[PDB]
Amino acid sequence: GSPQAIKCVVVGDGAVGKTCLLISYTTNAFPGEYIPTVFDNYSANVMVDGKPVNLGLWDTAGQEDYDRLRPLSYPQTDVSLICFSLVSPASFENVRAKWYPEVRHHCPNTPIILVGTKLDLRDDKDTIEKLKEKKLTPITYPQGLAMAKEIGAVKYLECSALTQRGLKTVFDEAIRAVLCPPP
């Protein structure tokens, strides 16, 4: 047959690491240094569970200024990654306050993966200490999983675009959430 075409849209607050996640996955290199994007397209031709897939990846802008344009990326979405940074509690709460409602509205009845980004920073002695000074604490795995279940996500996954810990898994699971498994 042909590789199954699967459209995956990536959303979440500005600076949670959406573009880095995509560039790290598709090229194996982490981009130079930060810079907001305005809807870039990426792709991956891969095997998952013995099936070839053409994964089309749609990056989106997290900033509020791009709210009116973001919806143009949603038609025909097969799976959505809702991203939050593990070291930004606000970005976590925005999963329920903003991103889930937006995705559910524009992409009803398609799978969602919840992605906790910047896993390397949850492990950063410094970063922790620094969050502490601000009365913040990183989001834990159980906390993340609970958000996932609240929003009906098929999976909760944690990763670092920088170290690539758990990176491949995010995309294999986004594809698995779409494919029809064996009998």
Ligand X SMILES: Nc1nc2c(ncn2[C@@H]2O[C@H](COP(=O)(O)OP(=O)(O)NP(=O)(O)O)[C@@H](O)[C@H]2O)c(=O)[nH]1
Burial 41-75 (b: 16+ CB within 10 A, else e): ebebeeebeebebebbbbbbbbeeeeeeebeebbe
- What distance in Å separates the CA atoms of residue 107 and residue 77, rounded to the nearest whole number? 7
The minimum distance between CB 50 and ligand X, in angstroms, equals: 30
Query: Nearest to residue 139, comparing CAs of 165, 166, 157?
Result: 157
Q: Pick one of 40, 93, 102, 120: the residue that binds ligand X (CB under 6 A).
A: 120
Torsion sign (Cα): 28, 159, 18, 109: positive
- The one-character DSSP state at 95 is I
> Is residue 95 involved in binding ligand X (CB under 6 A)?
no
Element (H, E) at 52: strand 51-58
Q: How far is the CB of 3 from ligand X (least distance, A)?
A: 27
The only residue of 160, 174, 175, 178 in contact with ligand X, by rule CB under 6 A: 160
Q: Which two tokens stand for residue 107?
A: 């992409």
Q: Taking the C-alpha atoms of 66, 71, 73 and 77 in order, what is their torsion angle to the nearest 10 degrees? A: 140
61-80: which residues touch ligand X (CB under 6 A)?
Answer: 61-63
Query: Interface with ligand X includes 3 (CB under 6 A)?
Result: no
**Does residue 166 touch ligand X according to CB under 6 A?**
no
* Selected range binding Mg ion among 36-44, 84-92, 100-108, 127-135, rule: CB under 5 A: 36-44
Q: Please give the residues from 12 up to 31 whose contact with Mg ion meets the rule CB under 5 A.
A: 18-19
Residues 6+ apart with CB under 8 A from 69: 38, 39, 61
CB closer to Mg ion out of 48 and 74: 74
Q: Is 77 in the site for Mg ion (CB under 5 A)?
A: no
Is 125 a binding residue for ligand X by CB under 6 A? The answer is no
Q: Is 128 in the site for ligand X (CB under 6 A)?
A: no
The sign of the torsion formed by the CA atoms of 162, 23, 59, 157 equals negative
Interface ranges with Mg ion (CB under 5 A): 18-19, 37
Which residues fall in the annotated binding site for GTP? 14-20, 33-34, 36-37, 61-62, 118, 120-121, 160-162
Interface ranges with ligand X (CB under 6 A): 14-20, 34, 36-37, 61-63, 117-118, 120-121, 160-162
